[PDB]
Structure 1
Amino acid sequence: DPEVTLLLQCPGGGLPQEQIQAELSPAHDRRPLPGGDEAITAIWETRLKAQPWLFDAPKFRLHSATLAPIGSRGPQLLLRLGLTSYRDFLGTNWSSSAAWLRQQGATDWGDTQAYLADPLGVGAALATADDFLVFLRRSRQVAEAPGLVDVPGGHPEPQDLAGQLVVHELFSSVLQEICDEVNLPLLTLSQPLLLGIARNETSAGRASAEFYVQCSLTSEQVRKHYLSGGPEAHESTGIFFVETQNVRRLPETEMWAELCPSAKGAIILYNRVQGSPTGAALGSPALLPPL
């Protein structure tokens, strides 16, 4: 799957909030463009002159993630974070010259991402009480991956000492996206576990943190909550469910060609970190059938 690469696969079935450190530093920001940031300003002015109702927004930028030696005690992951914006994103990752910027970045900084906004997305493998994952159908009238299948998530907005506040706002925000879009009560939701981080190669390699959340409602109750919002309560145009049994082989189904890249990352990481049993019990041929 060339539109998704894994940057991080978390250990021990996935990492709780309490085992993650963030470092938020201007050292982690995008580098100024070779000819200067005037190019970003130009693209932005042109866009507002077509769509004057648009507004800019801060985003978290992923610089890198470092995993501790496996089976160690103490914090298991360090996320190195800076700040970007919607505007810097439109002017870099979504620019026509994004492939050229990545190459100038290798030359100048030995980093394909150095000239890119790279805002950090979040997504969820969201399981029901009756062992299904939740999927959403994207509007055919939005710009990014129109009419494709997606999982709940978003692009959180800002505001280990501030670092802990940052990690808390990342975990908080995956639950908040589930409450806003799927219309579920917060109290039906487990604390998220981080499964890993995936990169979208169709969007110049911008990264999404992928989480696992369990809901106490059955699929039938989740559908009722979703639909009871009405067309204005969600940006998606439908909801649907696949048995966890059937997620194992989803990359061999015709559904795979319809999944947007960040949802592909969420399913691959769910399969590697939450699926894939290590024990004799869940390893046994009758519980884990071959091929």
Structure 2
Amino acid sequence: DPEVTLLLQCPGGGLPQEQIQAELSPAHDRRPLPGGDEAITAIWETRLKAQPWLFDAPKFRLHSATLAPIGSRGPQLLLRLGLTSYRDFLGTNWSSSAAWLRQQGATDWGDTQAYLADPLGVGAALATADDFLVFLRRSRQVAEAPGLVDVPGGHPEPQDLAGQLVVHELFSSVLQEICDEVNLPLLTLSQPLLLGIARNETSAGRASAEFYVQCSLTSEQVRKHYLSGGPEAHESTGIFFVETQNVRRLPETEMWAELCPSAKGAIILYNRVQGSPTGAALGSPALLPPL
């Protein structure tokens, strides 16, 4: 799977909000482009003069994520974050010249991402009460990954002493994205666990935080809630469900070729962090079938 790389695999079956620190600093921002940020401004102007209803929006930038020594007390993860925008994304990661910006970042800063917006995405492995994960079909008419399978999520917009509010907005945003797209009541959702961070190499290395969320509704109830919004209540064109039993071997299925990179990230991290048992009981052959 060359189009997805794991930046972080969380310990302990995934980290709760209270174990994560953020450092939001202008030291974590994109570097100005070698010939100047006028190249970004020019692409944006061209785009607005075709689609003048488009708007800019602020985004969090991922710089890096450092895990504590395993088994330690205290904060277990430090997220280093800066600020970027939708405009900066369109002029760097989405640019035809994105590979040239990665090579120049390696040369100038020893960092393939130094000249990339790299907005932080969020996504969920969302499990039902009857042990299915939730999948969404993307419209064939959008610009990014048309017609591909996704999981719930999005790209959160901003608003450890500003740090804790930023971690709160990241955990909040994955629940809000589930309520907005799947049409589930907030009180049917567990507090999220962070499983890890995956990078999309087809989008020049931009990263998504992948979470596990449990729903108290069955697959049939989740489907009713999604459909009862009507076609205007969701950006996706359909919903479907795969038994957690079968998610284990999803990379061997014909579905795998249809998953967008960030959804592949969520499923690899679900299988390594919530699946893959370590103890004698769940590891026994009748509960963990060989091959």
TM-score after normalising by structure 2: 1.00
Deviation of 1:188 (Å): 0.1
Residue 123 (structure 1) shift: 0.1
Q: Structure 1: give runs of 5+ residues left out of the alignment.
A: none
Q: Displacement, 1:102?
A: 0.2
Q: In structure 2, what is the Cα distance between the partners aligned to 1:37 and 1:242?
A: 45
Which ranges of 4 or more aligned residues in structure 1 deviate by more than 6 Å? none
Deviations 1:222-281 (A, max 9, x none): 000000000000000000000000000000000000000000000000000000000000
Structure 2 Cα separation of the partners of residues 137 and 284 of structure 1: 36
Cα distance in 1 for residues equivalent to 2:255 and 2:95: 29
Partner of residue 45, structure 1: 45
Q: CA deviation at 1:59?
A: 0.1
Distance 2:116 2:35 in 1: 14
Q: CA deviation at 1:38?
A: 0.2
Give the corresponding residue for 1:97: 97
The percent of aligned pairs where both chains have the same amino acid is: 100
Q: Secondary structure at the match of 1:241?
A: strand
Please report how far the alpha carbon of residue 76 of structure 1 lies from its aligned counterpart in structure 2 after TM superposition.
0.2
Q: Shift of the alpha carbon at 1:16?
A: 0.1
Deviation at 1:92, TM superposition (A): 0.1
Q: CA deviation at 1:26?
A: 0.2
1:84-116 Cα distance to aligned partner (Å, 9 max, x none): 000000000000000000000001000000000
- Equivalent pairs counted in the alignment come to 291
Q: Secondary structure at the match of 2:169?
A: helix
The CA deviation at 1:79 is 0.1
* CA drift at 1:136: 0.2
Determine the C-alpha separation between the residues in 2 that align with 1:196 and 1:4: 13
Distance 1:213 1:206 in 2: 23
Uncovered stretches (5+) of structure 2, i.e. residues with no partner? none
Post-superposition shift, 1:211?
0.1
SS in 1 for 2:129: coil
CA RMSD of aligned residues (A): 0.2
What's the TM-score once normalised by structure 1's chain length? 1.00
Match of 2:257 in 1: 257
Corresponding residue of 1:170? 170
Deviation at 1:197, TM superposition (A): 0.0
Q: What SS class does the counterpart of residue 49 from structure 2 fall into? A: helix
TM-aligned CA deviation for residue 285 of structure 1: 0.2
